[PDB]
Design a protein around this ligand. Sequence first.
Ligand code: TEL
Lengths: 82, 49
Amino acid sequence: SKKGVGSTKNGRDSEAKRLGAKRADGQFVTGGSILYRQRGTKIYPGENVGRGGDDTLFAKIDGTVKFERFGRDRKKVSVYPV
Amino acid sequence: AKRTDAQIKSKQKRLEKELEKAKAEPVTPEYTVRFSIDTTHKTGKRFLE
RNA sequence: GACCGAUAGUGAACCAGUACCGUGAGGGAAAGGUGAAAAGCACCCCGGAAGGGGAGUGAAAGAGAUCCUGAAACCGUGUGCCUACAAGUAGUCAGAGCCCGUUAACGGGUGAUGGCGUGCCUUUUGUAGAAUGAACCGGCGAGUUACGAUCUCGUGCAAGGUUAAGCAGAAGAUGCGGAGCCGCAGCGAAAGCGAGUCUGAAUAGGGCGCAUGAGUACGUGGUCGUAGACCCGAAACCAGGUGAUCUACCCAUGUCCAGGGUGAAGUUCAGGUAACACUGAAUGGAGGCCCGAACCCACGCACGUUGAAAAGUGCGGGGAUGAGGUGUGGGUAGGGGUGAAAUGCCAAUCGAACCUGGAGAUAGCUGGUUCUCUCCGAAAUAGCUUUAGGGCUAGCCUCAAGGUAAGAGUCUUGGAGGUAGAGCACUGAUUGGACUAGGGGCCCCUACCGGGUUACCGAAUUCAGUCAAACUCCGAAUGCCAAUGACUUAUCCUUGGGAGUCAGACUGCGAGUGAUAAGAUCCGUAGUCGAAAGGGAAACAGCCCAGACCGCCAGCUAAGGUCCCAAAGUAUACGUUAAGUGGAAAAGGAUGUGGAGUUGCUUAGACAACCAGGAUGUUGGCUUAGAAGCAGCCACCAUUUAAAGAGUGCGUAAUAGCUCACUGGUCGAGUGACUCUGCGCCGAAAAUGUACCGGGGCUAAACGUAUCACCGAAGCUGCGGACUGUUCGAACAGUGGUAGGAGAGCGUUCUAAGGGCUGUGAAGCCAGACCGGAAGGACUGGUGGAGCGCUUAGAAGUGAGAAUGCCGGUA
RNA sequence: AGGCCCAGGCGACUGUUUAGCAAAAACACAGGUCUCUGCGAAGCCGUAAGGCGAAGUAUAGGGGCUGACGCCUGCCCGGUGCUGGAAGGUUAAGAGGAGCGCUUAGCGUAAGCGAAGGUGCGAAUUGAAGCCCCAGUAAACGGCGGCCGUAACUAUAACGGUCCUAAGGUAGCGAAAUUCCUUGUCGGGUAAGUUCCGACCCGCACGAAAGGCGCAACGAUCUGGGCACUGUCUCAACGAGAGACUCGGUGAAAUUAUAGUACCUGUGAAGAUGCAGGUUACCCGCGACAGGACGGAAAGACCCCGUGGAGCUUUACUGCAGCCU
RNA sequence: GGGGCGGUCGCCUCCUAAAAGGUAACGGAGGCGCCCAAAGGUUCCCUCAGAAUGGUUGGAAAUCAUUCGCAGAGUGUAAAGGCACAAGGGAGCUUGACUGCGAGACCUACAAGUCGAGCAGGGACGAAAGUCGGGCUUAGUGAUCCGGUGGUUCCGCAUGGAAGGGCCAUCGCUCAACGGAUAAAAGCUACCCCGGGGAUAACAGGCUUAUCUCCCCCAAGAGUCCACAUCGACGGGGAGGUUUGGCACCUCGAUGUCGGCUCAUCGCAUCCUGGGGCUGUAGUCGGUCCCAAGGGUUGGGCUGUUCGCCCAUUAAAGCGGUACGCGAGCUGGGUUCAGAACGUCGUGAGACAGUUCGGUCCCUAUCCGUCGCGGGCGCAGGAAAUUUGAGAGGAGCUGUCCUUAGUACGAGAGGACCGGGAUGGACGCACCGCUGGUGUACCAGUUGUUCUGCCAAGGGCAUCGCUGGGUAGCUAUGUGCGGACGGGAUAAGUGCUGAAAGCAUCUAAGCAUGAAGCCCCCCUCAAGAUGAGAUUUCCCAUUCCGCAAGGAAGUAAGAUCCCUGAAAGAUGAUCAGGUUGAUAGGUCUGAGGUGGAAGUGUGGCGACACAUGGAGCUGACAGAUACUAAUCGAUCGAGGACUUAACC
RNA sequence: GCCGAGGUGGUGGAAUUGGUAGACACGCUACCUUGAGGUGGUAGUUUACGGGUUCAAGUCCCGUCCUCGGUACCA
Ligand SMILES: CC[C@H]1OC(=O)[C@@H](C)C(=O)[C@H](C)[C@@H](O[C@@H]2O[C@H](C)C[C@H](N(C)C)[C@H]2O)[C@](C)(OC)C[C@@H](C)C(=O)[C@H](C)[C@H]2N(CCCCn3cnc(-c4cccnc4)c3)C(=O)O[C@]12C
């Protein structure tokens, strides 16, 4: 016996895009290097960090990276020099 | 079932190929207006002297 | 001649394009060796001969006409040992007994008996596999060559390396020949510019460069490209021929058809008429007519089915004077003929014949691919693919050169991320109560106007409770990214050469699909197998222990075990169970027991049992002829009494007749409910045979807790070897392995300078109780009777157990 | 040296046919019909000569279809083919050459223009057959409907309405070589009949030359019944011969890893002889039997796969011969 | 999760996804192939949805103020992430929806994709600071090749041009099968062929057990009352591995398929028969349940059928396993080979979502395994017989009629258990005297032809020529027999005594009944029963070696070779005999069978009849008979190990 | 239950988003004609539903209901 029903309708899925931390806390980091790939602003730019057009957080200068917090319930990437 | 289902696709491919060679559009309709009038008011007799 | 030596080299070393095979075109073998010389065995014997035994010849006759050597399969003869109560992938290890006495050493042949043990190959996730291949033995049989590319290594010359054709030169080296090629300089599409240059408007930025400069010519080796390119294998396609001696049809021309019936047209005669029609006799001889021999054909059965026969025999069967059978001669030929049509037939071929060529077609598919040891050792994954059993790149493996100590673990520290859990603060779901606009329904009248009600539904509010992969006010353990120091081990990074692998399996865990089925499927994660032997689980890839260089008749252990198969405790202590539970399974059921926890009855007296009470208002009135409840309502009422419901049982067609209820007396101390939990019981059935302990068997030899010994592996240790790597003969560390990478060698044939051994016996062949870490190598002895080794180099037709391989011999 | 009878399906028949599985209900057949063809016919073979047709001439010769005979053969020309027409639209190459490039003497201080020539391209115009168009043809290819109401009700519709079509299946037949439902239902045969026969007719999914319906004869045809008959069977027995079996002569073959080759239960690539635990079993043959050796044979014919093949088809693609123009 | 169908093929978002990132499936949900000249930029401004009230037509809900509303709204668009310092709303001004780039990063096999501070040139807004290389982030798209367009201090085959090319900017692709094989492509194959796979489907085996079959729990209810005689809803728990399935683990270098035939065997979830308990069981009949697998379980019509229905029996016509048992055992009707036809579909070759007619079933048995028969040795001497039984096989079924007895029961109608007796069916074992069969060396009749020279009498051949009988042997359809009687232990059940637990109780102790089942009784085989047995009886303990153990070589009792043979038999074997002997052949008497022989005579013209004359013949039958053959021979075959104990 | 098709006036039924209680043929109603019927002549009645999109909806879109048929349990 094999009675026919088909049509899953749910095959497809998009390609995994690699959001999240690309560099860590206390990591030495050159200029222009992507610190955080995200959608929206799960984490904000702080000192010496810029937010991109695809709202990635990248470092503007050389220096270590710190994920501090924006006070209430909110985070922040900031790059400091040595 | 496979023997019948192979014909059921062959005839559809013949159909789509003859339709791509045919390309005979439906005829555009002629032009009508329908337009009409009423002017059904109760009117007296005398108009213009 | 660094070609062949009789399966090689021509197909053919020989009366070979022969024998055979085919109509034909065409295909196409097998098969060498007496001796130096015929001196080829006069003669005698058995024998009819064949063939022998002697004698001669001969160096040898074991050299006698398929004749040098003469292996292995296979077939025989004799005997040393074993063998007619034992199943044994046929061995190995232990092992007596017997019989020998070698290349003389911890000898050799046999082996009763014990432990262990399911061939090799290929393909596999996995093969003893009831998957494949081979009957055995022997020979033959697969990664080569040319030209070119690149990499490593070698050598010469080196910012210059080097010639090719050619000429001369013994098929040579060498001399000449620099024409050419590659490099030294790159950048740009190009003009061009030049240690810079393109883009650019830019003195900017960036790309590619050099400032950190080596190439080139040859040679070995790895690999790639073009060639049949590693062997073997298609079905097929095409070109030119050969075939109607079978068969299809046709053409010319002959020939065959025992016999028996039926009886057409016509004709004649008689009747009949106006003449015809018509009727009846006879005659006639028609017929894809009938029955049935020859002959032809094949339908039914049985037999044959390694046949008597590659289509038949036996018994019956159809046609058997015409669309007939058949002879002879002839015609049509393949993308064609022929076809009373089946794609049937065309030489035992046919949806397009056969042969030979292209041709070694192609094969992403299958099979095979041959010597050894050592170092290292995968993958079954991602992406893409007219891709899905294939391929490419990346991951993983290996070698070398580098950079060189970056890697790795753990502690401390900082982070990102929102699952498990939990919670309702969003989003969805949702249980009940409280109110609650409102929607009905009963209606009253009445401009659906005003209302009056209901325990008929209720939108929204609130309290209290639930739930969520796509819900989060929250939020772990881990894993992950880092830095920082700290130790502790070395293994990362790059460049280049070479890969293989993209069929995975199961187990534990986290999910999905499924039925929260599957030895199912599909991911994450870790292990194991793959590619892992050893011990345990009876046997068993995948479970547990643990990783094999080797020897030992040495010890300690892991898992698992200690009554006997079968090594170790009939070990100790304290409990449990009694079903063989252990050694198969649920809801549920049960006075099975063991242990914890409370409670009620409770020597002014329970429980069991014995005795008497079985009432009063009122014998209870209806649906009823009844019900003292009793086929079922209505009160769940209330005192006589130490004590009785107007009722739980029993019974009749209902009352009837009763029993318990409930308290008294006799008795004489444990009794009577409940909960948790330990070990058990039933529930409990299937297929050749005990059959769900491996077995015997066990009541501890089961289970739980605890302790001590002991056994137990190829683990670890001891001792002794060998190899690889590290530090400068020693130490330290190591050594399973498939595909695969790498390294060291053994052997064969030939050549080359050396060296020398062979008629006092070479190669080969047959034996051995010899040596080496392997491939292998000698030393004796015997056959052979003329070539052949050693050392260093070179070049390969280079090593076979597997192809349903080819040929031969033989089972 | 015939068995016979009763009924039915198909095919009229005699013939022919898959050598070597199918002998037929398949071909063929006389008959019917349609169409081609004026004779160097048409069609065919061949590039062509040359032939067949055929030393034939429409009562002849090719081709399609259906198959004696009897009664008949309905409707549709909308689509596709043929056939005829062709006023008109389109439609090739060849013809034609308006023009535009490019080059260039020359003119231009530059910028640019530029004759003639060469040369590259090229518009208008003309240009057949075909096709579009207009008719005929169905024994050409083919096709042949729905729904609603209505009669003393118990039902159907002679009848009427209305969509759609090119027309809506006529006669005859009908559970059939065609009926799925299905063993339809009724009747017969039979003790009992899924088959059979006669009816009915909700024809899944008959139907008039893919012919419809019948039909004497015929048929190694298929199908049901009956008489006779019997070892075909209840249910086997005996006898004869040829093998088998013993002896003398001769003597293969497929197969085959080596085999000293038990059976339970289990395990295991999930179906063991060979493994495990048990159980049983002296050694060696001869006649038998065939359960196992996933026995032998044939590199599965089924299924999938291969960017394999080959025959066939068509309104698949691309071409070619032919045939018109 | 075979292939086809369906569905999908590229990109984005969430969940799966296991708190980095990643991650699959034909897992769960959705979107995309765009839109916007403002929905971009900047500057300056500013805050949302709802609710409660006040408000005509305005309604439940437009717009208004009014408080409370850090968030539901809004964010072009799915969904996630994010946002009230706006990224959400307005208005002005604007074109940065710029050019050349781009240190460095994320991502990734590659091709690609994403982010990018900053620099320069030119701008926009802003006083300036500054921000702006599109939108709130992530989708809104495709390579190359070939062509088009635009521009260019590029090249341009001798030179100048040009044709043409390069560069830069750009356009043409649902190349949607989205890394795109061509600019261009659909089918049949049953007429089929090849290379592979059990990498992949069916059959059968395996895991699973949703489904199926079977069993059970709870109990509402039905059953006049009454859940539990029999039923049992709503729900729940299991077994089995026979159904339909799931998965693809073995096999595609072949594991033959359904039904039937032959032959079975096994399970018990029992169809009959046996024993029981409960009843809503009066009796006959029953219903359900428990134990029991020992035996039995039919013959026909139609169908290929299993199945099913029907007819007629039965005590019953059980369900299932064994490759839906069994094709190296058989059949081949059905299905799925080639021919052909119908209906129907397709334009078609062909096909079936159908039906119909016809169609090659190969194999000498090696091993195991079965059923039989031999040959060797063993069994501490060699022999001949008779045996016990470990063990093993077989058998094991049951009807009807009569009597008890018209008794028990019943109001009747109807009608018994138990206890006896007869006679059957199927099956089994024997045997042939009877009934029959067969009887091919028996007897008779007769045809055709031919031979014995002829008549007569015979022979050959024609299936033994045919036909009528038929002995022995073998045989059933025939006859005789059997499965009986019983013990012992049980199963379900029924009980005594009887506590634990003053009672009660088939309980732990103690006892006993109780089935066709178990063990025996019955029949067969059976000491290879290597555990080799036990009885009774025969023969006896010789000859050399050799120094022994031991060897060999004559024998005894006994047996065999060879021979006559059948009661036996494939061959071996067994058995009866081998000259003091009836073992076979012949003989001669007989039985039996056939039936009236030949010759002769008589009667008839003759075919022929009758007498001599129950004659003649006679195979296997049985009784005598030494006639013939079983001759003479030859071979094999004991000398009895050791220890201990007991005896004398 | 799944797939495919249609749901208009009493009837059958056309309508590419653009005016339909119906535009087209029948019924039906009122009148006329006729002795009275029939024919004939004159006039007359929200697209299955609910919610959008649109300036406009039978139509375009999302859901519900019904009926035909194919595809199943069972007899
Ligand atoms: C006569 C017996 C034939 O067997 C059968 O054919 C048949 C009975 C079978 O059952 C046989 C066992 C088959 O096996 C089966 O194959 C199936 C495909 C599968 C089966 N299992 C695997 C399931 C398997 O059992 C098969 C495939 O044979 C086809 C075996 C295969 C090896 C053969 O083909 C085989 C060689 C046959 N053959 C081929 C010629 C056939 C044509 N022909 C006919 N007659 C003649 C003939 C007559 C007279 C004279 N000359 C010639 C020639 C023969 O000549 O003889 C055969 C052996």
